[PDB]
Design a protein around this ligand. Structure first.
Ligand code: E85
Length: 216
């Protein structure tokens, strides 16, 4: 996250670090006891760290989970920006507590009103030099209407302003949360107002997400 602040420890209990060979790779969001939503482009040994604030310091809620299954969206492809969702099934149901709690997601397929303030969090890089934070960062960003944002922004995507405050490398797959509801997933440039952050609209994929979770 560029232009943000250290988050209050465990105030976003849905927040997940998707890890590759023991290191933070991507953000993710806990959406059921056994399921984490992230970005297909993120995907070697894949695990998910729940209940974390700091990557390095002991916390009673920190737990690392193995991934039984990785389910990219059928239409996802390495070339395109479209359909960039990934569902990760954990090795077991996560232990829920004050610091680990699924986030409900939007299933009514309608845009977030432009100008709405949404919260984006992650352990992605905090400056253009690639400095990686130890602790979770966040920032509030206003939604940008699709017309202004537009060529490439389809009805399955949405934009948020990137004027100094922005998501960046390592924040991919993390949640865009508007009024306590998951609305987007972070999917490029950072901190440049001319290139808004692009986010996948979870409501466009409601049927696919239900269908995968319903295979329990
Ligand atoms: N702001 C939208 C957004 C969302 C998610 C990820 C991203 N960026 C990136 N995703 N992957 C990346 N691999 C390498 N570099 C990247 N950006 C970068 C790195 C150093 C300096 C700088 O100004 C920008 C990114 C950007």
């Amino acid at each position: 996250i560029l232009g943000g602040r250290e988050a209050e420890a465990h105030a976003r209990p849905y927040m997940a670090s998707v890890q590759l060979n023991g290191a933070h790779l991507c953000g993710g969001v806990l959406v059921a006891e056994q399921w984490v939503l992230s970005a297909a482009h993120c995907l070697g040994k894949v695990q998910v760290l729940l209940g974390a604030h700091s990557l390095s310091q002991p916390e009673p809620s920190k737990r690392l989970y193995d991934v039984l299954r990785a389910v990219p969206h059928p239409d996802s492809q390495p070339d395109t920006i479209d359909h960039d969702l990934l569902l990760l099934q954990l090795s077991e149901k996560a232990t829920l507590g004050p610091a680990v709690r699924p986030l409900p997601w939007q299933r009514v397929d309608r845009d977030v009103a432009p100008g709405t303030l949404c919260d984006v969090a992650g352990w992605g890089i905090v400056n253009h030099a690639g400095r990686r934070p130890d602790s979770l960062q966040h920032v509030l960003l206003p939604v940008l209407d699709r017309a202004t944002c537009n060529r490439a922004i389809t009805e399955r995507l949405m934009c948020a302003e990137s004027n100094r405050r922005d998501s960046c490398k390592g924040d991919s797959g993390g949640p865009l949360v508007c009024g306590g509801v998951l609305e987007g997933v972070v999917t490029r440039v950072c901190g440049n107002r001319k290139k808004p952050g692009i986010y996948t609209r979870v409501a466009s994929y409601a049927a696919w997400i239900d269908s995968v979770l319903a295979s329990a």
